[PDB]
């Protein structure tokens, strides 16, 4: 168990969230600090658009970069779908056998197999989704979830303190 | 070693205080929280008041509580003022042993020992001080120290939206 490494990391995270100068630049940083220190080998946040019912990729480490701003995912649709709807996590060790699962070959993205979704929930208000991947195909431990769980508190914040000032 | 427990109080506190609907009352519940959490039998808070050159106490759990919004602690004096100008942890087993400490036997406080003092810093910013105490002599652990630590990121951001928000 490396719960005291999760203690430090969520130290040093939230460190830089706070000192991001804008949202953009605080989850680009998670993306890529998740993945350094879980370690997992991607790991994408979807921002909600409710107005046209869909996730947004916001960003990723591990996907296409162009992908950004422009993927979308209907609400209540896939396995994303389905975290959002719960607003509760979703732990798996391979994610491509649950019968919720879309799979998108021509998309030319790795082959996952661990997957933790993780609802960004702000007062009871769903305002997004952070998706974690490994190509292992292991589930993500208790601290694992415990710290992304914790961060997404974090990113919920974030996201409502943008939205609040006209930022999104 | 508890840093699985401190995980999940992290969790559950980071939501709390992000659902508190102003800052006094997030910080007297991380007060409250630390102490039955950790546990601890003393949290106190105080946020700088820069024009007057003295920390203002602000929230307390084990302390008289009359004494919040009262107590002033000048910059520099003492073990506190010493967390202050390190802008670094003070974790000690003994605190009134320790040859900065100012004893106040006035105020009929319990006799604590352990002391943990913590800077709440934004972005290099000084903003106050989260102290925890306890009875038995005993230094706190280090799952302990980072839980605290990492919370009082939180605490900076809270305090610096406040003042922000002219709140304060
Ligand atoms: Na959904
Ligand atoms: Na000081």
Known sequence: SNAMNMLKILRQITQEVNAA?????ALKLVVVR???????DACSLFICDDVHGEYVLMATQGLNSKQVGKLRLKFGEGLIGLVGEREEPIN???????????????????????????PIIEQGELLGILVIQQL?????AEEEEAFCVTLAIHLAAEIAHARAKGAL
């Open 92 to 118: 798996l060790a391979d994610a491509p056998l649950h019968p919720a699962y879309k799979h998108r070959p021509e998309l030319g993205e790795e082959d996952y197999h661990g997957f933790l979704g993780i």
């Open 136 to 140: 292992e195909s292991h589930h993500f």
């Open 21 to 25: 100068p804008n949202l953009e630049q």
């Open 34 to 40: 998740l993945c350094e220190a879980l370690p997992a």
